[PDB]
Amino acid sequence: TLYDTIKQQKNVSEDAKVVKADGHGVYSGIYNTSAASAKKLSTGAPYNNKDVKILKEGTTSRGTWVQFSLNNKVIGWMDKRAFVYYPKATNVKTLNLTGKITAGSTNGLWSEVPGTVNAKKLATTAGAYQNKDAKIIKQGQISGRTYYQFQVGGKTIGWLDARAFHVYDKIQSQSNVNWNRTILNADKHGVYSGVYNTSSSSMNKLSTGAKYNNKKVKVIKQAKTARGTWYQFQVNGKTVGWMDYRAF
């Protein structure tokens, strides 16, 4: 009854910040479990606001003690209450997308998924990249929001809420062809400079297909995206643009 029984112990992998730990001790072991674990090594004040790694946790009747390490040098054990654990991003996966930043100016710009360890706000908004093209290379979630890591001009900028991006559809397949078709009732569709919604320049029509009605054309390419199938066509032997296949 001099020392307390260790009731539970487990290895963990967590990042945390020591906060307001002046009134707590660092010990060679879970507090008051042996002679060695009864004498205080030092207070927690030397480690206030420093980031640490949490390696183990153990409980006794008096509380929970965790084994932390500073710069991968284990320091000892301290009351779990002396620490603020960083949350981890979930659903973290590598990506290979491109899109246009359309709401960079109404979202902050971060160096990691916000709230996670080492996450800093690089700019109050990402307005510096508004309406720019970007490559999306990674995602991660936290608090129910998805954050994309992204590049502009070949340089990784940071992390931005996925709601700030307009992601382009990929061209799933594409082939050269040689078909002669007559356009009939193409008013409902538009003509695009590229395959529809695959780039900045193919989001907005050059015209409607109404102008080319009852006209015989030459389909030289076909492309499929998640949104449909597009034909690149020619009149007078010159390429007009791309249009939904139903217009033909």
Query: In the chain, where are the structural domains located?
Result: 1-88, 89-168, 169-248
| Tokens 């029509």 found at | 205
Picking from 173, 178, 171, 194, the residue whose alpha carbon sits closest to that of residue 243 is 194
Distance CA 85, CA 62 (A): 21
β-bridge mates for residue 14, sequence order? 54
Element (H, E) at 6: none
For CA atoms 90, 96, 99, 101, the dihedral sign is positive
List C-alpha distances in Å: 28 to 10, 37, 148, 212: 17, 5, 42, 83
Q: Are 22 and 82 in contact (CB under 8 A)?
A: no
At residue 105, the 3 state secondary structure works out as: helix
Bin 84: left if φ > 0, else alpha if -120 < ψ < 50, else beta: beta
Picking from 19, 51, 44, the residue whose alpha carbon sits closest to that of residue 117 is 51
Distance CA 247, CA 183 (A): 6
Show the tokens assigned to 6: 């260790």
Distance CA 221, CA 216 (A): 16
β-bridge mates for residue 38, sequence order? none
Please state the separation of Cα 201 from the chain's center in Å: 25
For 108, residues 6+ apart whose C-beta sits below 8 A from its C-beta are 114, 121, 123, 124, 125, 126
Distance CA 127, CA 147 (A): 16
At residue 162, the 3 state secondary structure works out as: helix
**Residue type at position 216:** K
Please state the separation of Cα 144 from the chain's center in Å: 12
| Tokens 């093209």 found at | 133
Please, what is the end-to-end C-alpha distance for the chain in angstroms?
89
At residue 211, the 3 state secondary structure works out as: helix
Q: Are 78 and 25 in contact (CB under 8 A)?
A: yes
Q: Are 63 and 80 in contact (CB under 8 A)?
A: yes
At residue 76, the 3 state secondary structure works out as: strand
Distance CA 231, CA 218 (A): 9
Long-range contacts of 132-136 (CB under 8 A, 24+ apart): 132/100, 132/101, 132/104, 133/98, 133/99, 133/100, 133/101, 133/200, 134/98, 134/99, 134/100, 134/101, 134/165, 135/96, 135/97, 135/98, 136/95, 136/96, 136/97, 136/98, 136/99, 136/165, 136/167
Q: How many Cβ atoms sit within 10 Å of the Cβ of residue 247?
A: 24
Show the tokens assigned to 121: 């706000």
Q: 242, exposed or middle or buried, with CB in 10 Å at 0-12, 13-18, 19+?
A: buried
Which value in Å is the resolution of this experimental model? Answer: 2.1
Q: Are 93 and 136 in contact (CB under 8 A)?
A: no
Distance CA 194, CA 230 (A): 9
Q: Are 148 and 159 in contact (CB under 8 A)?
A: yes
